Swiss-Prot record, chains A, B, C, D, E, F:
This is Capsid protein p24. Phosphorylated possibly by host MAPK1; this phosphorylation is necessary for Pin1-mediated virion uncoating. It is found in: Virion. It comes from Human immunodeficiency virus type 1 group M subtype B (isolate NY5). It comes from the Viruses. Forms the conical core that encapsulates the genomic RNA-nucleocapsid complex in the virion. Most core are conical, with only 7% tubular. The core is constituted by capsid protein hexamer subunits. The core is disassembled soon after virion entry. Host restriction factors such as TRIM5-alpha or TRIMCyp bind retroviral capsids and cause premature capsid disassembly, leading to blocks in reverse transcription. Capsid restriction by TRIM5 is one of the factors which restricts HIV-1 to the human species. Host PIN1 apparently facilitates the virion uncoating. The record marks 88-89 as: Cleavage. Transmembrane segments: none annotated. Residues 3-88 are annotated as: Dimerization/Multimerization of capsid protein p24. Homodimer; the homodimer further multimerizes as homohexamers or homopentamers. Interacts with human PPIA/CYPA; This interaction stabilizes the capsid. Interacts with human NUP153. Interacts with host PDZD8; this interaction stabilizes the capsid. Interacts with monkey TRIM5; this interaction destabilizes the capsid.
Length: 102, 102, 102, 102, 102, 102
């Protein structure tokens, strides 16, 4: 309880990129004595959960566990104005154009 | 009054995701020398009251004080990018289609 | 007048949680010499008048001086997506659906 | 002459609150050796023209002559999630309902 | 390339007021051994190019050849909520009232 | 491989201006022992790929290979309010007016 660097608290800021935070999930796992597959609940899940919902709305479409070159190119969409370029419109199309409910 | 790290002032930074804040509610409790049940208002309900309403509006849907993993996945959208990806659009259609008041 | 933080101007950040600013307000209440009832204007009404329009606007809805526990909950909306979810939902439909003037 | 901050341009930030920058120019008039009365037209006029379009827009609305406590009271409307929260209902409604031009 | 503070890489933060940054541009211009006219490229067009698109768009409206106090006056609008109130609203009116395309 | 700051991972902060990050990519290119022609592929492509999608959507529009002055001028639009001033008008019109899908 209250244990840091175990990924149980690693976190990507709203404006913090997936790539940069990945270093926080990799590097903070360096501090953690684990197995490579063990780290996979992270690389795949806490990397997808605590990491900037842009990554959720992204890794949910792109998919999770996408290679570091894929989740990179994609989660590079993550970002304050960086995602506003793409996500801004998406929510705007989630309501009116593409995902308009009823 | 003004006692720190007792959960009474632990709060979800409105931008701090539900996790960043839960963690704070957890680890800082290590410092708070309390009873396990006492920590239960602190985990269930503080985590539901002074926790940035983004996680509250969710937490209710999830059920208040639901398991941390459960409130975590749902409230991971709490934090910036999620509530902006999703809730911007949700409330928007609450106003127009789903929740049109009168 | 203008003595350091006499309450007369204590400030809540546009995003600073009410509980937090309240920490500054209380902290500076200590700095100024006021009877408790005298501090009551300082708590009940200043807190409403000069504390981040996120709370002050609400504080009009709860009425000036709603018990700090009620107001704590009201002003717990203060925040980015936590506040803006509500403010967006209310303002967006005020203009179009709920309060469309003329 | 016109050395920095003599009430030449004492500028207010965008989110920097009115009481924060008002505290600065008062302090900066101290930086300027002028008549007490001189400082009066400096605090009433120059302050208003060069300070935060949020409080500059308010300052016009209150209209000059508003005692500082009254200025800051209206300018307490200033702020990102703070003024924006009031600007959603205030300005987002100018384009559509209140200030619909032609 | 990447020459320190040669104006070419001097920049205005997206939020940085026009002036705060101009203090930088100028402050280093004094350091860049240049002719007055040369400094005038830095003031007329670079000043614009490397300066916060809130205002970069403005300085065109103002158009080059305007006094620094002229651009500054128009650029007190520069700012997050400072500029959003006038310009976000302008954008709000760019979709609905005045700049409605097609 | 994937040595730090070898350009393979150089990145632009979402808010980090294009010009700023470009200084991180160029400077770090100095750290990268690469043929100039190689560096060119890094300046043309990699600069485009990991440099803040604000620019990615811009550089794509301008066309890859645009001169740094050309990428810069447009990417000076990169930024929070700075890119938002344009992008908000754009994405908003991508859903409703110009890019309305179906
Ligand atoms: O994206 P950045 O340049 O890093 O800064 C952003 C941006 O603030 P600006 O108005 O200065 O551009 C957000 O503004 P929005 O476009 O989302 O309105 C703001 O949002 P809020 O005013 O709603 O708080 C957000 O904060 P957040 O991520 O908490 O939503 C804040 O980021 P930082 O606080 O991390 O600097
Ligand atoms: C209500 C609030 C929380 C403050 C909010 C809401 C929506 C957004 C983004 C979209 N959006 C959606 C998901 C993720 C991103 C992220 F940044 F994380 F990448 C993103 O940009 N659009 C608005 C931003 C803004 C500011 C003032 C004027 C207009 C707009 C449009 C940003 C913040």
């Amino acid at each position: 309880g209250g244990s840091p660097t175990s990924i149980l608290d690693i976190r990507q800021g709203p404006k913090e990129p997936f790539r940069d935070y990945v270093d926080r999930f990799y590097k903070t796992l360096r501090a953690e004595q684990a197995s490579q597959e063990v780290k996979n609940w992270m690389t795949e899940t806490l990397l997808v959960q605590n990491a900037n919902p842009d990554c959720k709305t992204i890794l949910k479409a792109l998919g999770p566990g996408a290679t570091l070159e894929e989740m990179m190119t994609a989660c590079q969409g993550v970002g304050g104005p960086g995602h506003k370029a793409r996500v801004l419109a998406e929510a705007m199309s989630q309501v009116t154009n593409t995902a308009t409910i009823m």
